[PDB]
Design a protein around this nucleic acid. Structure first.
Lengths: 388, 57, 133
RNA sequence: UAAUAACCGCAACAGGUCUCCAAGAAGCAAAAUCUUUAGUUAAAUAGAAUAACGCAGGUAAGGGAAGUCGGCAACAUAGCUCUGUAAGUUAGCAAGAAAGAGUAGCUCUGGUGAUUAUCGAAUCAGAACUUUAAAGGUUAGGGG
RNA sequence: GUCAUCUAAUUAGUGACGCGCAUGAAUGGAUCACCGUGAUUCCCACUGUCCCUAUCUGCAAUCUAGUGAAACCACAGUCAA
RNA sequence: UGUCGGCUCUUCCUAUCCAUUUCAAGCAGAAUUGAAAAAAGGUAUGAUUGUUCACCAUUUAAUAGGGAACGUGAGCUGGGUUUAGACCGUCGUGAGACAGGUUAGUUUUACCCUACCGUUUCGGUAGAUUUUCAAAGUAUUUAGAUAGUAGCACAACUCAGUACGAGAGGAACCGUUGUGUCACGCCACUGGAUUAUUCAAUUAUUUGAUCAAAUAGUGUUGAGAAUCUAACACGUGUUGAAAUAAUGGCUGAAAGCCUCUCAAGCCAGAAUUUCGUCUAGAUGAAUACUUUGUCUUUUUCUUGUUACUUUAGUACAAUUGAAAAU
RNA sequence: CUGUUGCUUAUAGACGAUGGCAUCAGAAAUCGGUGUUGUAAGCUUUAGAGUUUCUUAAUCAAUACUCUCGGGUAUUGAAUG
């Protein structure tokens, strides 16, 4: 018999199975489609989510009824200290997809990058890249490197630079760096390798990769929740109060005679540590150099982007950062992989200029009142302590 | 905007507004003040309010 | 009869919700039956926010208005709702006025304040509205 | 022993089995709640973690029975004092009908007796002042 | 059943009509004041019954040390025709 | 073989109700009617009734029809039916009968295998020797056969009181701005829970009184950080390319003409298909270090792996294998 | 090399798993910041309606003033040192 009434199915089958990831960092399964009529450039980065705040921004779109004094928006702060490029790899197009050909590495490798090649560092001999470094300048090894460079220019189609973070610049307790392969989209493969070689051992900033008021994609791992029922996993209806043996379950898990439970039925299981890519994320402020502060042309107080008492569970942001309109997957301290949009958004809201009027740096605990800790002391004035 | 009960300077994008049938509207900084306003509590008798700290000292 | 669009207002008025009638057309209270423009979902009840046209019945009023179905516009509600400019606000009671499909108001007076969401949508209401909050 | 281990139930079974003696607070009360004399701390094992689904006890924005066979379940009223109380009626009732007001703390005042000024009873009424404006910790009628 | 009424809406309720398949007079007929852990309908109040679910506590469930059963069991256990 | 209905949930059919693309009308416009492609997405809220059914009042772009042991009771409920109590009406001499009505009537077990959802453990893919090489071990960076798939719909402004039409009436393409739902997230702002028995107050009992507590299995009340969460807050799915279905066309024979082709060859054309994009993912690849350089087995040490150790045995550089297309 | 183990370990979690650090490890207090509640206890304003007693001398007195933007709490899943 048919169901009496119709309703959309609960949950999405575009993400089945709901298997939790193993590595905190999430790898972009794609890069923006290459154009060979432009100068080579980097098409990705990697930052650490600090927290969230809200800003008042002035609307520049026309033919809209939004208030002239400003609209309240939520923004996520992604601290992105400079990266260190420690090698590059060429990929070839074969009948089984891309196949890496060679990986040329730099002469000097940081201890942050070496920790990735072990599991118990404090017991290791820490001899990673030792033979590579000690024999870097030998004619036998120098000749081999020139062959590796020439091999890529002859039989490769994709170049990616192996860049890693610097964990000393962030309040995280992890010391081992996070390694990401960032593709070079640009001219011919001859000048891609030329551009790649120039970047060895150099430091890259987020401003060189992303511009101003640019829509990007974000890939990260969502916040974990452990084992969960069908009401939270799939949002099914709770059963009436009278029900024997419990309310929060799916009553019928299949008809009689497919004789098996279908893969489409909502079942309990793991929700949480899932990889998700969200596209069309606007960059509000490119917090590099001049814009490293939280001041605006309207609100001219010199205040750091960190709220009073620091970002909850994170700490203090003292490096470059990005302001993203809205929410991104993952809790604070999560590693965030950034990338240029594969399909750029041409909507009038995507091309719209961003002009901020106010950035909220009040404390994120409780019902705070003051923006800077100085103006808290000004309003309250002297207290019993200090004066006694 | 200044809170109707506490008398504190209300931060932007924070607090709630209460509109009465007598065409008078009040904006509050937190549910702590709004609850005390709804109980007909005199802000001059509440020690931490900005109004009390003006009448005295 | 409505002019222009309306932003998102969290609808706090359900089906079978009794509201006051701030009009002067002999109807005391109205109970919401359906909401015009509401898009159905299984087991969901029709919802109405400020400035929402509704279909309501009068269970208290003059004999020429009682026990009949009317069309009303929600002008204020006790449900907290947020404007796009970061202003969180809510009224003291739920109220509505009786208007027809073309939007022209049946009565000629409104008691108390009127939300900007309902005033801008229906020009005839704003003309009879004392204050627009 | 006379019973949450000596009795009857297959048992060291949350079931059942006749009696005597019986403190303080508080209150109308042998009520709920806390303590004294007496008894006991063991009465089918524990430790760690603090997932889903459960059993027991709860709370909730706006709406208010639209849920459902059905207000099932829960919520709600609840003591005392004063005013007031309908139709109907076997004239006895309905009736705690329905409905409305008061109630705290502190400092005082008056009434209710006995022996010829002293001695004693908790009870009722009244007045200023102050506060977080007062039956509601427990107990405690939803109404038509 | 038909007519009123209750509701926005009434196979429900109440009040009327009566050639009543097949009511009816101690197989008792009609009429109810009080009373009822009896059956039914409607109002007020209130509320997670519901829109639509969130969240808190205790006990388990989870794992471990000791201890440790039972129903059931031809052989067994992936699907389509 | 637990026998009605409802609730919850997934999937399937098309004989399509809506949205998309088309042809026809006795199609001027608007609104409609007949038909084709197409089943990827949607298809409601209530009064009465146990009802399936029905009939009403609304809302909507539409409120289409069905299957899955008349889907679904170790999923619920027990309203109906369908035991045992009782009442009425008719029938029967009587005990008693009534798809006649009424009222009250226990809904047991998963800890087994598999299916499904999640989650561990051990094992592992064959022909290369340019030592700048080749293979094994450990770790990272990647790869993507396969499987799933997600965005829809409506409204407002402008076009425009314009096209059309005697008038009455009265659109559409581009563009712009929102809303609803579904999906994925998220904790800034607003709201909710709250045993931080946090802070404050307070009823009763007990500490000789104050202070400070305890007890009433969380005494109670007000405010209440954190954490979680919103149907109650808010972000993203406005995103590109090619080829198609129905259909309309181009050149063009058969059949000197005609014809879109039951011919060869082309074009335009869908909520379509496939790339692109998202999720899980097998065999894999590159680099780093440790080795080894003709080979294996049985033993054996380790939590385990590799190198490693002993006794042997075994081979030792030199004629193999390519036109492509039709 | 890898695993056990330790931090009564986290961005994770039923258990395994996963993520981090392991002697420059880790933990702990204390301090400052940041939040919550609302002005501690001792003495003083005759604050103070009245009573009482010496008879302007005290008392006892709910509540109220100054010290006091006080005191208490604050990772436990907060941030520095």
């Amino acid at each position: 018999s048919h169901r009496k009434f119709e309703a959309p199915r609960h949950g999405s089958l575009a993400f089945h199975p709901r298997k939790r990831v193993h590595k905190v960092r999430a790898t972009v399964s794609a890069f923006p489609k290459d154009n060979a009529a432009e100068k080579p450039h980097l098409t990705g980065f990697l930052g650490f989510k600090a927290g969230m705040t809200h800003v008042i921004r002035e609307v520049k779109r026309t033919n809209t009824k939004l208030p002239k004094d400003g609209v309240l928006e939520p923004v996520t702060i992604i601290e992105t200290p400079p990266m260190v490029v420690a090698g590059f790899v060429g990929y070839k197009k074969t009948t089984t997809g891309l196949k890496p050909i060679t990986a040329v590495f730099a002469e000097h490798i940081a201890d942050e990058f070496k920790r990735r090649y072990t599991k118990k560092w404090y017991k290791n001999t820490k001899n990673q890249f030792a033979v590579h470094t000690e024999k870097y300048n030998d004619v036998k090894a120098k000749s081999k490197r020139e062959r590796q460079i020439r091999l890529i220019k002859n039989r490769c189609d994709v170049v990616r630079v192996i860049a890693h973070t610097q964990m000393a610049l962030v309040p995280l307790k992890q010391k081992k760096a996070e390694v990401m392969e960032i593709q070079i989209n640009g001219g011919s493969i001859a000048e891609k390798v030329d551009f790649a070689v120039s970047l060895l051992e150099k430091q890259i900033s987020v401003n060189s990769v992303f511009g101003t008021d640019e829509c990007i994609d974000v890939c990260s791992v969502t916040k974990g929740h452990g084992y969960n029922g069908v009401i939270k996993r799939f949002g099914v209806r709770h059963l009436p109060r009278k029900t024997h043996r419990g309310l929060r379950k799916v009553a019928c898990v299949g008809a009689w005679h497919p004789a098996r439970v279908s893969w489409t039925v909502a079942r309990a299981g793991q929700m949480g540590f899932f990889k998700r890519t969200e596209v069309n994320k606007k960059i509000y402020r490119l917090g590099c150099g001049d814009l490293k502060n939280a001041k605006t042309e309207f609100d001219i107080t010199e205040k750091g982007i960190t709220p009073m008492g620091g970002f909850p569970h994170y700490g203090v942001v003292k490096n470059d950062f990005l302001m993203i309109k809205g929410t991104v997957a993952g809790i604070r301290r999560r590693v965030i992989s950034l990338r240029k949009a594969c399909f750029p958004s041409t909507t009038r809201t995507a091309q719209e200029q961003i002009v901020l009027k106010f950035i909220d740096t009040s404390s994120k605990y409780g019902h705070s009142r003051f923006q800077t800790t100085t103006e808290k002391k000004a309003r309250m004035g002297p207290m019993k302590k200090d004066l006694e | 905007q200044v809170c109707a009960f506490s008398g504190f300077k209300i931060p932007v994008a924070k607090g709630r507004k209460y509109v009465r049938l007598d065409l008078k509207s009040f904006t509050f900084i937190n549910k702590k003040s709004l609850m005390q306003f709804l109980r007909k509590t005199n802000p001059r008798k509440v020690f931490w309010t900005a109004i009390y700290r003006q009448l005295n000292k | 009869g409505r002019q222009g669009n309306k932003f998102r207002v969290t609808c706090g008025l359900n089906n079978a919700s009794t509201v006051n009638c701030a009009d002067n057309t002999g109807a005391k209270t109205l109970t919401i039956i359906s909401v015009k423009g509401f898009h159905g979902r299984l087991n969901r009840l029709p919802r109405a926010g400020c400035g929402d046209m509704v279909v309501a019945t009068c269970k208290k009023g003059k004999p020429e208005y009682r026990k009949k179905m009317h069309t009303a516009v929600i002008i204020r509600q006790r449900r907290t709702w947020r404007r796009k400019d970061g202003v969180t606000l809510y009224f003291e009671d739920n109220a509505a006025v009786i208007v027809n499909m073309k939007g022209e108001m049946k009565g000629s007076a409104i008691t108390g304040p009127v939300s900007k969401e309902s005033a801008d949508l229906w020009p005839k209401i704003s003309s009879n509205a004392p204050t627009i909050v």
